[PDB]
RNA sequence: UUGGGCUCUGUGGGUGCUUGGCCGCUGGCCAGACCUACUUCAAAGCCACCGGGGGUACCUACCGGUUG
RNA sequence: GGAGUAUGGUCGCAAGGCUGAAAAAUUGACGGAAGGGCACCACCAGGGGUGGAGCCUGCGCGCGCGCUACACUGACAGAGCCAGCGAGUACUCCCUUGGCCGAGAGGCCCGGGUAAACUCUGUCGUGCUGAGGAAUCCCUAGUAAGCGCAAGUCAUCAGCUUGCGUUGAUUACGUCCCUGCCCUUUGUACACACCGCCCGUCGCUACUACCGAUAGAGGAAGUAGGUCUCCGUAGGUGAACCUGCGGAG
């Protein structure tokens, strides 16, 4: 039995698949080979609340909407959606008588 | 396991020994196992029943293969013979005993002829 | 396979006899460790067995961790307790009768990961073989008398303990017309246990409550629709199966949906169904002097 | 043991060493460091070599004669034959190490117990 | 087919692609021959595997001192 | 004497009744629509019980559950040929007419109440000599069902339980349409790939203002860039040399 899996992190760069390979006088890879970045567009950027603008919030779709340009109806419904996810996780006698 | 999500899907079971060599039929209809429990085993998974058909052999299994025409399986067992089956009509259709057809030997500290 | 299960099961037995010797030891070792923190003086034999002191210095950490509950004891359950889902089959006796077969259908429904099986013409040794080649948690029998079930027989597989009990006071699912009863929900039921206060009580609760699936632990006290109960008095454990809706944080309503049992367990064996030559653990002792006065559980 | 008793890494490697050696069969329990100390022994290793454990499974009468058998080569492991008479049989492989394909020995056994399949 | 047979036990080639024997080797020798001369200057360093816990008065390794 | 362990008895507290049975919530309460996964308690192909009559354990006269009977798959005569489980010095259905030998208690003897199946050969032929409604409930592979044989295991079970063997089919083996049950619409892993903000009624919270009694609790709503060399200088510690300035290469 090998071991329990201990979590290990390993960093990758922005440089290309040719930078990943080993050493030889040619790249084997084609010409469209080489301009791919070893990471994904997600990695370089995704819109998120954590990178959101000030007056605006991101959508689950990842679309920018301002709270001011927002409607009240959508406001109510997004409050409902967030909450849905959340749930998924002696005195005077005068004063007395009068 | 599921590729697209990673969390475990199904522990198939049925095997009276460790499972020795595995392959999918190239269309993807059938998983085939061979285990050292003298037996080879047709797992049809992606059907709605996830059924199993046994195949009794003569001895332990060692390696499995398919035909690109996905009707035929070739399993290579421990006596050394190949047995060739058609998948659907699970009937054995061919066999080759190739023991002398492969014996070459006499290693160092190999005191048999 | 078969040489493998013979291998492991005997290794369990031999390791138990090992645990007997070493726990007889650790009894002494316990008193040493307490004295160090306490400074209260000790038994002089404990003060002057040299291999004991050195062995203390090695084997401290087991004692303190067991005090912590950091580990669960070596067990035929502790290997796979809350990891993987126990699948369970229910089978009738050899030639079943129809009302019995319906009642077996009922208790298959009460469990959530079960299959029933028509027993038919099947040697019970080969039914054990089917077990240890499909890696079951649990086999379960049923024995009727005349249309009425009488005994069940839980075994824990691959090799674990077996309960064997009579039944009494049974009601079926099928005495009530379907206009009033109905298909019962296959949700993962909770379990509650009342009055098991022997170590033997914990044995029998262990062999019971490792039948059911693992609940998810996040909101389990909040969620859930269905509750199974085991209560016991006069060593006749009574079990009901109820379903409930919570009408308030101060009020709740229950509905009774399963069969009503009382079973009284009369054979508990660290040893499966075929092996009649196995080590029984507690049998029900009538015919003795005070087998009626005392109770276990 | 020198590590203070209350440590995580101590607890983790107590369990690790113990369960690993136990799956190497050289022990007999898996809960006692003192047993690791004055119990783990080259003699126990030798009794988890291959010929000794085939005497224990009762392949052959005396571990000498067992050495003679596996040197001629009737004794398989898994699916391979084995020549090296120090193939340390861990506990998961004691259940498997059995007789080879074309063996006069296996045919002798089937001779005595009267099922002698010539096929 | 005008003896047959088993078993044992030797020798010889084979069981890996064919360039000679020997010696102080650009030559000689296989019958061998000559046999002891000649010299400017010791050295660069490192590493170099004995099963575990344990004691350490004496020996040793090291490190730091002390008189002569 | 000391240290523990028990055991019982003593003592003090607990042991003074504005009282007379029948909430939490920035997290919560409840839906709905879509989409998936499933199931002889769903669909579909069939099969098979019970439910008709008799017997009776059981359960509450009722009620099923088991056993029996009910005819073409017939009856009689032969012939042949197959199982598996079971070994405690242990096993019996009566109870009775007579008689024997038993002074008496008995023991005798005579009377009365290792398989079915299956195959083949041949003889006769529907002949009170009638297979169970509406309902309901169960079943998908050595399974439905048939057939016997044995055991009798500290609970249950001889008005039967449980085993073992024997022969062994049809029929779906797909689909969420009906019935339902569960699960998605959060998280729990990233590449390609794709998807692209579900919807309702209220609660709780902050704020805003309103209303009306006596600063005040209430009611009622909304909002969330000069290096190197050389030279001429001034100072330093002087030959030299350093520092700084100013000029040439």
Short mmCIF file of C-alpha atoms (C1' of nucleotides) in Angstrom, two decimals, chain E residues 1 5-7 11 14-16 21 23 31-33 35 42 45-46 48-56 63-64:
data_model
loop_
_atom_site.label_atom_id
_atom_site.label_comp_id
_atom_site.label_asym_id
_atom_site.label_seq_id
_atom_site.Cartn_x
_atom_site.Cartn_y
_atom_site.Cartn_z
"C1'" U E 1 21.61 -58.50 -43.35
"C1'" G E 5 21.19 -55.23 -26.13
"C1'" C E 6 21.33 -52.14 -21.75
"C1'" U E 7 24.23 -49.29 -18.66
"C1'" U E 11 39.17 -39.33 -25.73
"C1'" G E 14 31.04 -28.68 -31.80
"C1'" U E 15 27.97 -26.02 -28.49
"C1'" G E 16 29.42 -17.28 -30.38
"C1'" G E 21 53.63 -20.29 -30.59
"C1'" C E 23 60.37 -12.89 -25.51
"C1'" A E 31 69.11 -25.87 -30.24
"C1'" G E 32 68.36 -19.53 -28.14
"C1'" A E 33 71.99 -15.31 -27.02
"C1'" C E 35 72.87 -11.33 -18.63
"C1'" A E 42 61.45 11.71 -2.95
"C1'" G E 45 45.68 17.74 -2.19
"C1'" C E 46 40.73 15.15 -0.89
"C1'" A E 48 37.84 6.00 0.99
"C1'" C E 49 31.29 1.40 3.52
"C1'" C E 50 32.18 -2.56 10.32
"C1'" G E 51 24.20 -3.53 12.39
"C1'" G E 52 21.10 -0.46 16.91
"C1'" G E 53 20.32 1.59 21.53
"C1'" G E 54 24.23 1.99 25.84
"C1'" G E 55 29.03 2.92 29.35
"C1'" U E 56 33.65 4.83 29.00
"C1'" C E 63 40.38 19.99 19.27
"C1'" G E 64 42.27 23.35 22.72
#
